[PDB]
Design an enzyme around this catalytic site. Structure first.
Site, PDB file in Angstrom:
ATOM      1  N   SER B  21       0.849  -1.187   0.000  1.00 49.76           N
ATOM      2  CA  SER B  21       0.000   0.000   0.000  1.00 49.76           C
ATOM      3  C   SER B  21       0.890   1.243   0.000  1.00 49.76           C
ATOM      4  CB  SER B  21      -0.900   0.031   1.230  1.00 49.76           C
ATOM      5  OG  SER B  21      -1.683  -1.149   1.331  1.00 49.76           O
ATOM      6  N   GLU B  46      -0.997  -1.185  -4.468  1.00 50.08           N
ATOM      7  CA  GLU B  46      -2.226  -0.534  -4.051  1.00 50.08           C
ATOM      8  C   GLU B  46      -1.944   0.930  -3.747  1.00 50.08           C
ATOM      9  OE1 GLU B  46      -3.974  -1.108  -0.075  1.00 50.08           O
ATOM     10  OE2 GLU B  46      -5.864  -1.514  -1.168  1.00 50.08           O
ATOM     11  N   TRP B  47      -2.592   1.830  -4.481  1.00 49.27           N
ATOM     12  CA  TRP B  47      -2.540   3.252  -4.153  1.00 49.27           C
ATOM     13  C   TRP B  47      -3.696   3.550  -3.198  1.00 49.27           C
ATOM     14  CZ3 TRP B  47      -4.290   7.894  -7.575  1.00 49.27           C
ATOM     15  CH2 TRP B  47      -4.035   9.092  -6.883  1.00 49.27           C
ATOM     16  N   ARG B  48      -3.359   3.918  -1.962  1.00 47.24           N
ATOM     17  CA  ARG B  48      -4.359   4.312  -0.970  1.00 47.24           C
ATOM     18  C   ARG B  48      -4.706   5.776  -1.156  1.00 47.24           C
ATOM     19  NH1 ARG B  48      -5.386   1.495   3.816  1.00 47.24           N
ATOM     20  NH2 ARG B  48      -6.353   3.530   4.308  1.00 47.24           N
ATOM     21  N   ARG B  82     -10.073   4.015   0.648  1.00 49.50           N
ATOM     22  CA  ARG B  82     -10.628   3.384   1.864  1.00 49.50           C
ATOM     23  C   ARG B  82     -11.426   4.434   2.617  1.00 49.50           C
ATOM     24  NH1 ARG B  82     -11.579  -0.120   1.089  1.00 49.50           N
ATOM     25  NH2 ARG B  82      -9.709  -1.433   1.040  1.00 49.50           N
ATOM     26  N   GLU B  86     -14.735   2.642   7.003  1.00 47.82           N
ATOM     27  CA  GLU B  86     -14.001   1.384   7.102  1.00 47.82           C
ATOM     28  C   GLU B  86     -12.519   1.562   7.403  1.00 47.82           C
ATOM     29  OE1 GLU B  86     -15.217  -1.865   4.631  1.00 47.82           O
ATOM     30  OE2 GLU B  86     -17.299  -1.126   4.618  1.00 47.82           O
ATOM     31  N   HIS B 143     -14.231  -4.457   5.927  1.00 50.65           N
ATOM     32  CA  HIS B 143     -13.259  -4.333   7.001  1.00 50.65           C
ATOM     33  C   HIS B 143     -13.992  -4.178   8.303  1.00 50.65           C
ATOM     34  CE1 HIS B 143     -11.818  -2.848   3.198  1.00 50.65           C
ATOM     35  NE2 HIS B 143     -10.677  -3.430   3.501  1.00 50.65           N
ATOM     36  N   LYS B 170     -12.862  -9.692  -0.707  1.00 50.06           N
ATOM     37  CA  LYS B 170     -11.808  -9.407   0.254  1.00 50.06           C
ATOM     38  C   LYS B 170     -12.391  -9.005   1.589  1.00 50.06           C
ATOM     39  CE  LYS B 170      -8.585  -5.966   1.867  1.00 50.06           C
ATOM     40  NZ  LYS B 170      -8.461  -4.497   2.002  1.00 50.06           N
ATOM     41  N   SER B 232      -0.485  -0.557   6.170  1.00 50.44           N
ATOM     42  CA  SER B 232      -1.643   0.174   6.683  1.00 50.44           C
ATOM     43  C   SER B 232      -2.287  -0.442   7.940  1.00 50.44           C
ATOM     44  CB  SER B 232      -2.699   0.318   5.607  1.00 50.44           C
ATOM     45  OG  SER B 232      -3.824   0.997   6.120  1.00 50.44           O
TER      46      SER B 232
HETATM   47 CL    CL Z   1      -1.816  -4.333   5.832  1.00 51.17          CL
END
Ligand code: CL
Ligand code: MG
Ligand code: MG
Ligand code: MG
Ligand code: MG
Lengths: 246, 252
Positions: B21, B46-48, B82, B86, B143, B170, B232
């Site tokens: 991330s 993964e681009w957060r 995100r 969550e 999540h 997921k 993260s």
């Molecule tokens: Cl993580």
């Protein structure tokens, strides 16, 4: 919780410890295997006495134990006769098995013995006492090579081992499904939280169960087995260290 | 069992794949993190996006996505906003969140988007369809940073994600006890037995849950998150160490 110190090794603190098993039929086989293990990274050397051909000849067993000690002088030695009914190579009568383990204690050559939980309560208690009177530790063991009992049954066997005076309760079970691996881990957790007051060893066998050897620290197993087996000692140590420092 | 191929990476075969991330507040941070991540051993970037300050400025988001693709040229890019709901860094309205994900799809710069299951069924279905029409894969996510739902509830959420068209369901949950880690693994196994027909990702967070980041191959999780410097969620290990462990399990 008690830890179990064997020589300088402390079972029950730090990362899980590594046991390897030496299997030889003759004295020359035992020597050859000891030489093969000498530079490997492990903590306890288990001699699998049930493989030895001359197990009922007291002088031969003594000679073999001595030969191992001459070659590997810096690792605790665990004396294990595994019965055929628990995955081993041969069967002894109860009296022969108890006499064999008492003779191992008497020799001064072994640091630990393995006693099978279901040998007989009176025989187990007497032999635990005899080992303790000579400062020999006891791994009390149970194996199911065919299936995984329910978690509650696994827990009750581990609790019985403590009742009978084991220094280190040990159980190994065979998964037939993925859920069975989880059952073994659940039993480990439950034993740890409810009953354990000393180190315990738990394992789910076979390829399917190898996560129980690697990622066991969080759940409460103090040692596991590697090969010089389901996993090499070098790779086992690599993973144990990563997870200990995670 | 359907697999998901991004670039030429196959999710749902072999050893679990490693996601890292990338978090940056500004374009400058996005560029420096990308350069710092370039040499790390991972499979999916993964681009957060929720960490990005200018998320409501379309030009800025597009420039940052382009910057990532310019620097890291050989990894599939997963676009993940995100929600604060969550556990993310900021909140958008439902409409802004959907518009952001559609703009990511439109960019031609992203290989995958993350869509949260509980965004709303109509919105999720529409956005899955839009992504698919542009050959963008969808990780549909859920999540719980407080607790671990019952195994049957975890299974039913993953099943629902399949119903809504997720390429990869997921779920990430937080154990309150060691047993909860095992519940997450139980749910993973049961989902595989009863309903899965595509790759799934499952995780139990915190140090207690680390087994769930390692044991995907045996219990049925197709990818896992590792840290470059810091991940993260709680409980991660470094991507090099993660690859070491995954490889040992794959060859055992
Ligand atoms: Cl993580
Ligand atoms: Mg004496
Ligand atoms: Mg730890
Ligand atoms: Mg279009
Ligand atoms: Mg495999």
């Amino acid at each position: 919780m008690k830890t179990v110190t064997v020589r300088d090794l402390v079972v029950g603190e730090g990362a899980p410890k590594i046991i390897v098993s030496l299997m030889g039929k003759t004295i020359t086989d035992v020597k050859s295997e000891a030489l093969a293990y000498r530079e490997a990274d492990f903590d306890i050397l288990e001699w699998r006495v049930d493989h030895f051909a001359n197990v009922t000849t007291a002088e031969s067993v003594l000679e073999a134990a001595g030969a191992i000690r001459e070659i590997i002088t810096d690792k605790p030695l665990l004396f294990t006769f595994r019965s055929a009914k628990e995955g081993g190579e041969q069967a002894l009568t109860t009296g022969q098995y108890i006499d064999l383990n008492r003779a191992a204690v008497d020799s001064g050559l072994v640091d630990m013995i393995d006693l099978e939980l279901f040998t007989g309560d009176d025989e187990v208690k007497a032999t635990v006492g005899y080992a303790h009177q000579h400062n020999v530790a006891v791994i009390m063991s149970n194996h199911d090579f065919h299936k995984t009992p329910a978690a509650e049954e696994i827990v009750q066997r581990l609790r019985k081992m403590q009742e009978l005076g084991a220094d280190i309760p040990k159980i190994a079970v065979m998964p037939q499904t993925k859920a069975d691996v989880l059952t073994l881990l659940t039993a480990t957790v439950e034993m740890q939280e409810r009953y354990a007051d000393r180190p315990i060893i738990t394992m789910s066998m076979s390829k399917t169960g190898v996560i129980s050897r690697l990622a066991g620290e969080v759940f409460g197993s103090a040692a596991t087995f590697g090969a010089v087996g389901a996993i090499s000692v070098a790779d086992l140590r690599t993973v144990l260290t990563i997870l200990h420092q995670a």
